[PDB]
């Protein structure tokens, strides 16, 4: 139908906007701490601690399959990256500190994204 197509154009455009959001958030991680999944070879107990692992590469795969229906779903995954790290790693670590800085800097980006998603519909 013509409606299904219209819907698909909206999802494509959301995907376009979320791709630019993802790029801006990932720039706030210049150490690449969150770029890839935590290695289960190198942290074999990880899934005993963290039940829903997340990382920027995993988000990008979902994004490119148009697997984010709305900004809320995308933000859920970004929040997992941060919250997983802040639980597994102690306060005095470069990993925890990196997550705090990503959260703080990402806030700005996500605030305007929400306005843009509502604005453009």
Curated annotation (Swiss-Prot):
It is found in: Nucleus; Chromosome. There is a cross-link at residue 41 (Glycyl lysine isopeptide (Lys-Gly) (interchain with G-Cter in SUMO2)). Residues 9-113 form the Bromo domain. Highly expressed in testis. It comes from the Eukaryota. Coiled coil: none annotated. Scaffold subunit of various histone acetyltransferase (HAT) complexes, such as the MOZ/MORF and HBO1 complexes, that acts as a regulator of hematopoiesis. Plays a key role in HBO1 complex by directing KAT7/HBO1 specificity towards histone H3 'Lys-14' acetylation (H3K14ac), thereby promoting erythroid differentiation. Component of some HBO1 complex composed of KAT7/HBO1, MEAF6, ING4 and BRD1/BRPF2. Component of the MOZ/MORF complex composed at least of ING5, KAT6A, KAT6B, MEAF6 and one of BRPF1, BRD1/BRPF2 and BRPF3. Interacts (via PHD-type zinc finger domain) with unmodified histone H3. Interacts (via PWWP domain) with dimethylated and trimethylated 'Lys-79' on histone H3. This is Bromodomain-containing protein 1. It comes from Homo sapiens (Human). The lineage of its organism: Eukaryota, Metazoa, Chordata, Craniata, Vertebrata. The gene is BRD1.
């Amino acid at each position: 139908s013509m409606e299904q197509v219209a819907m698909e154009l909206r999802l494509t455009e959301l995907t376009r906007l979320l791709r630019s959001v993802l790029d801006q958030l990932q720039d706030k991680d210049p150490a690449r701490i969150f770029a890839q999944p935590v290695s289960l070879k190198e942290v074999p107990d990880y899934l005993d601690h963290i039940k829903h692992p997340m990382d920027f590469a995993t988000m990008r795969k979902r994004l490119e399959a148009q697997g984010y229906k709305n900004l809320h779903e995308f933000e859920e995954d970004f929040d997992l990256i941060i919250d997983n790290c802040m639980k597994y790693n102690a306060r005095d670590t470069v990993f925890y500190r990196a997550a705090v800085r990503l959260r703080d800097q990402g806030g700005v980006v996500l605030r305007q994204a929400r306005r843009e998603v509502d604005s453009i519909g």
